[PDB]
Each structure stands twice: as structure tokens, then as C-alpha cells.
Amino acid sequence: GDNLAQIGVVGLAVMGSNLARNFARNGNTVAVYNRSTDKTDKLIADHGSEGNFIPSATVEEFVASLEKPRRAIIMVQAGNATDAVINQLADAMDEGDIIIDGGNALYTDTIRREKEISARGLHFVGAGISGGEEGALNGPSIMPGGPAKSYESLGPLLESIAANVDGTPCVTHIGPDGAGHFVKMVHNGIEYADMQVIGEAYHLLRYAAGMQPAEIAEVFKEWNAGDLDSYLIEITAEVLSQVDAETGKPLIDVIVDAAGQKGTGRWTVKAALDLGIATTGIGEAVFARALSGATSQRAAAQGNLPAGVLTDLEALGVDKAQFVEDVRRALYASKLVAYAQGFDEIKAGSDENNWDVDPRDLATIWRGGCIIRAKFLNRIVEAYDANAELESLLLDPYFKSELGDLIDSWRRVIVTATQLGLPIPVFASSLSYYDSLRAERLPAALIQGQRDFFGAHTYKRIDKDGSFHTEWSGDRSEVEA
């Protein structure tokens, strides 16, 4: 009846609350539960006007106040807190019901949980939810994984709260089991890289070009008009514009430059290492966060490492404005490299786990409700639309056409930065990855040689299939392995 809810949310911290309210604000009847009932009461009291909520003090009431097939969404801390609730819902649920973790869960746990829960006759969906607390309230990006029959009852509910971009719901069936939580973690990694490339551009503009932060804010606003158009560059301009009331100096000059990597960024570069994917952009970005928090080591390194002979833009004879454009092109290229790696990681996760994930879906639903939202994503959708089996976003004709006009600026940026001794982790590592991909012969041939010498590790040959070994200690003849 109308006394039954279409969806329910277990765990009413700010995030679980915001998501329940979002379901209620878009005309869904929503059941809400929390072990400590005090939280439930505070939702009803302070936000009950936003729509039609059905509160329960027990798990068995919650499950009884839900229409069928029963959709419940868990929004408690990741790990053991989560498994607790999952077991409680299955004890109480009937066969054919759908259980959903919407918390930030390692995708390996999601596969374990999906096997066990499906075996118990139920249905398990792991659902990535970006946008933090704001997105959860006003429109997130939803990335759900589980049985495709479950998105049939779940899909239209999520399409009602999801961020909308040009009439299209920023949510779609990702693939089976852990695909959703996997793609959310890749998206958290591709954000560290986005924040890092912007940082690098800012650093080169402040210390090579001698631009104050208010003036750099203006340059980002103008770049936000072009191809780089993104929510992150938009807000970066707001931050650099800010002034500290107390001191009168730019707010950024009064913030301790120490940013922990205590987040998801490190899980992305780990699966990359496990799937054998060169994610140098996200890696360098995660590493750069670690280095910033080395307070004792930075204090001791300060002014104590030799710089070498350094020049400036004036002595090089470099026009400020030409250099600003060059940094913009270096930024763009480095973002492309980061994304090409991230989408490689997606394709490798998908093959390893037989997921059949469509990169087009991710590029489409990441246009709203998350921090990486940018017009840029549309060209990734188009690229895969033109060639499902594109071996790299770099090889898409549009992007390959762009690289043609980026490359010289990119090279000039790494050269100039070295000549002024300025930190450029992603810009420089992206160009090395680029020049690596385009090379006919890499120094791995010699690594194979070293390994065969010290460990009889074997090497393959260009002209003949199978493994081979040189009798290094012996006659230096070559034999089959």
C-alpha cells in the first residue's frame, strides 16, 4: 500500500540521512532505520517535511514496511559495521529481496558478499555513490553492481535522485558484483591526478611566471571557458581569489601545505599494480600527497639540498603569455595521459573479473554529482562510441589530433621547469609515459638480459616463439628453455 516504502536506508549518519531525504524529495516513500533510534527521530523531526518517510526502531519492522521486491540501502562505516547490517537484513528478509551497500567499500569484499548473499537466495548490489554529503542530498553519481534483474526494480528509484545532465540520470547498470565499487575507486584515483595537474599548473604560474594568486584565479576562469571546462578548475579560482581576513594575505599562503593521502587514492594505485597497469599520473599524485606530509624531513631538507645553476623566464627570453598557454597545454596533455591510464585500469579490472563494463557509461554518468565533472568526459564517450576496442584514449582521432597541438608546449614546460628547479611529478611523468608508448625499443630488452644473466630467468625472441636462455657462465651459446 502507501504504508509500504519503495526503498529503505539503514544507517542515518549525515550521508545515509542526505540520501533518504533525496529519495523523499523526489516523491519516493522511504523507510529509515538506525540501531541508535535517536538518529532516526532527529531525521523525522528536522527533515520530515521533505517527503514521505516510514521510521522503524527495529530491523524486522523496517523490512516489514517495504514493498516487494524489497530494496534496502546500507550507509554505515565500511568493513565489519557493514557485514553486521548485511546479515541482519538477510536474517529478516524473504527470498528475492535486494540488499545494497552504498558505503565506500573495497570491491573485493563486494564480490565475497555477492557470492554468499546470492547463494542465500537473495540479491546483492554494491553501489558507488560520489559527491560526498552534498551529492547524496542534491544529486550524486551512482555506480551500482550486482544481478542485472535487480536494476529492473532498483534503476527507476536511483534515476529519481541521481544528478541529471541534459535529461540523462547519472546512473546505469555498471556490470556484475563488484564492478560498481571498482569503478568508484578508479574515479577517486582519477581526481587525485586532476587535483595534482591543477596544483602543478598553479605552481609554475606562481614561481616561474611570478603571478599572484588573485591573478592565477583569473587565468583558471579563462581556461574554464575552453576545453578544460571542469568543476575542479571553477572552484580552484574561488580558492585562489579568497583572502584571509586576519592577515590580508591569500588564504592559500596561510594554509599548512600538507595534504594526507588518507583516502581512496591509494586503493586505485594498487589494483593498477595488481592488474599490471602503468598508472603513473595517479601514482605520482598519491606520492606527491605523501611527500607533503613529511614535516620533519621537509624541515631538515629546507635550503640544505644544492639547487644547481638555475635561470628565470627573463634570462630564457620567454614571453609570459606564451608560457601561460604552454602550461595550459601541459595541463591538458597530462590530464589525458591520467585518463587514458585510468580507463586502461577499468578495461583490465573488467577483463580480470568478466564484467563487460562500457567505458561510455562511466564517462556519461561522471558528468554530474562528482568532483571530476567536466565537458572533457563527452570526448571519452564519443571515442569508445567510434571504436568499442580503442587500445588507448591517446589513439582516438579527436584526442590524437589535440596531442599534435599540445606536444611542443608540453616539452617546453618540462624543459623550462627543470631550468628553474620547479616540482612537476605528473607533467614530467606523463611525457615519459607518452615517449615510452611511442618508442619502438624500450630498455626492458636489457632488463630481460640482466634477469637471464643473474637468474636464468629466460627471455623471448622477436623472430622465434617460446623462451630462450644464454649459457652465460658457460660457452655463451643460446638454448631453448
Next chain:
Amino acid sequence: DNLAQIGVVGLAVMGSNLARNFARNGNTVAVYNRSTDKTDKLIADHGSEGNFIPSATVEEFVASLEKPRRAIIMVQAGNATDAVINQLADAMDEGDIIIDGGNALYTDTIRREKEISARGLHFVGAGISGGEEGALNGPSIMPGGPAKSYESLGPLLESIAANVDGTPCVTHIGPDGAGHFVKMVHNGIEYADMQVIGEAYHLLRYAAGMQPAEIAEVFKEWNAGDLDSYLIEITAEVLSQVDAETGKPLIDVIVDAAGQKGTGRWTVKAALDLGIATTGIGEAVFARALSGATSQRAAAQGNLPAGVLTDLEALGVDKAQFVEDVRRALYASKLVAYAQGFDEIKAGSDENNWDVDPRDLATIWRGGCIIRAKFLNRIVEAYDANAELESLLLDPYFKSELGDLIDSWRRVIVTATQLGLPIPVFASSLSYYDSLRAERLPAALIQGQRDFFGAHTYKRIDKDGSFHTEWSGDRSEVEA
């Protein structure tokens, strides 16, 4: 009597070679292998090398060991290793010693310690380097476990360990998984050492135009100086080898796909979760992953725009100043890799309660290991002078060297970029260096970005406490 002092479980190449190491060094060695065919091949071929006491069952193997019983496990890492451990503990006496010598994950070793520690026994996780020739001819052995066990075990281990200037390349590392942890960091450092040699060889061949034969000759020249290493010495051989079938240099015929299928990745994962910037080892592992992506390489080869490129001739760069500039970029990039590697040891040591002495490692890595080089003595000296040295880069010797390395370092990154050649570790290392020097890093901006979109608080250089700016409202600042 008629008892073995030490026993080896796992009679494949590592294990048979190890058992044969103990025997050749005049200990009596018990040998047992689940499948008995291997236990036979050993006695059949290498039984003449020393006194082996072979067993078909775990009971017989444990019956042949002198008390306190010492058995080394040399089998597949993972489920195969956890099984042999229970089979041993189910037959051993209180006070006996189980040693795992395989490439174990250090978190399983810490857990295996407490499981076995409980049952009255002692558990040792021992990193064994040097592959199969080192297992026979002299490995570096990095044992972690209870100190009171090294007393029984050390003298046996010192009898087979690689020996350098009369000092044995084995010593107690620290409690539980300390030994397996430093073995994993030694393997990560090995990838960086190999990658920097690659980058140099690449710039000598593609920027200077030297053929393999000539690169060999300049590598033996560098081996007389400060860079003396086993890796550079073998590199010159590899580079001199000619493939008989075609007549072209053997490395021109090798598929240039390394493959990161090793333990190099376990180092970066550990670094990532310990809050340590491992850009050298990281980029080294990344470069291996990239080399192996055949189909993406076939597709990108000749299809990505290079830009305008120059050569050394048009830059007016002298070949001889360039080859010495490359030598210094390699020396500095390797020094960055070692400093990050030793920061990971500090962190991992501090994360547990290990008190690991970095000096022991630089000392026992001088033999057995592929990374053995004269350079390690300088790391020992750096930590003798300052036990709390914040970075190897700051140790006065290393810092004095960097003074003379930095200008060549910058010219190499610059020249490589202008010739479109890939130099990942050389370039990652310089940004890390320039990061360490910077008074203000981009993390200040990142804190601002996070406070705006996630109310993720920030800190201030003047006042104390955490602060947030009402970005969506007044844009004022309110402590939280």
C-alpha cells in the same frame, strides 16, 4: 648422534641448492619434500657433496633434528607454506624452531609468528636473496623472529651466507616479519637499480648513437669509479653478447617486455599504505607494466605525434660531456631511489616495533644480492654519523656528491625531453628532489580544494587548531 643440525623442507631448485649449501659447509642437513621423487634426485646427484639425512615423512624428518629443532621451509608462498608449518608444529617439541625462507608476504609472517608463538614454539621469517646461484654459492639472509632463536640459528646461517671482507651477509633483523619486510624492500630497490641502467643505456644508444659493443666499454669504465656494482658489471657482458643466429647484438633480438610478475609491486603497495613517496621504485614497476602491454604498444608505435625534436649535434653538445652527464644523472636518480627505500624501512619499522638498524641492511646486501655495490658502505657510514638522519640526501658525503651531480642531472632531463627519449626514473627523481627543496608545495591548494567541496578541514601556519571557510555562504573562517 646421527642427527642433522638444520633441516630443509622443499626440494626444488631453491631448497636443494640451500640444503647443498649447508652440506658443502660441513653441517649435517635433513632433507624432506612432500613428493619423494625430489628427495631422491638430490641424494642421487648431490649426495656426494655432504652428509644429508633424507626422510619420506614429516615425522621422520623432525625425528632427525638435534634439539632445539631447526627446519627451513622452501616451498610455494601462500597455502603451500601455511600447510608445512602445521605439519611441523604437529610433530615438533616446545622450544623448536620453524623458519620460512620463501618470498612470503610480511603480513602473513607476523600472523604466523603469533599463531606459532602461542603454541610454545618459535617462528622465523627469513628473506633469502641471490636466487638459485646465491642459495648454492652464498645468499644474503634477512631473519626476523625472536632474538633468543638467532643464537641457535645464526651460526648455521653464517656458515652458508655470502661473505664480504670476512663479515657474513646475515644478522638478526628484528621481531616477527621484519626480515620478510626488508627482503620485499630489497626487491623493490632492485627494480629501480635496473631501470636507471636502462635509462642510461637508452640515452647512450639513442642520444649519443653508441652501438651495444661501445656502451659495454663505457659501462666497464663507470665500474672503476663510485658506481661499482654487480648490476653494471653484468650489464656490460649482456651488452657485448652477439646473437650467433643473426649476427645483430643479442639485445636487439630480445622481446622488450619485462613483465612486473614479481614482488616489486608488493614494495610500492606497502609504501602507498605507509605514507612514503616511492617514486623511483614506483616508476620502475610502472615502466615494467607498460613494456608488457604489447597490443597497445603495436597500436601507439608511430601513431602518436612526437612534436619538433632535435639531436645533440644541433644542440652543440659534446659526446664525452654527455656520457659523463648521463653517469651523474644515473648516480643521483639511484641515490633518490635508495633514500626513498630507506624511508620505507624507517616507516615500516616504526609502524611495528622493530627498531630495524638500516646499517645491518647496507652491510648484508654487499653479498648474495643483485644490488651488491660499493655504494652500500656509504649508507652504513651515513647512519653511523647520524642514526636519525632524515634522508640519505642530507648525509654530508651524499650531499657533497649531489653538489657535483645536479647540473648534469638537469641537462640530461632537458636533453632527453628535446630528443623525445623516455627517462621516467631520472625525471621522477628530480621532481622529488625539487619537491624536497620547495618551501611551499601545491598541497596548500589541495587543502583549499578539499575544504571547498567536502568541508575537509585545513590547518594554519600561524594559529593552532583546524579551520574551515564557509565557501557556500559568508566565505568567513570558523575553527572546528
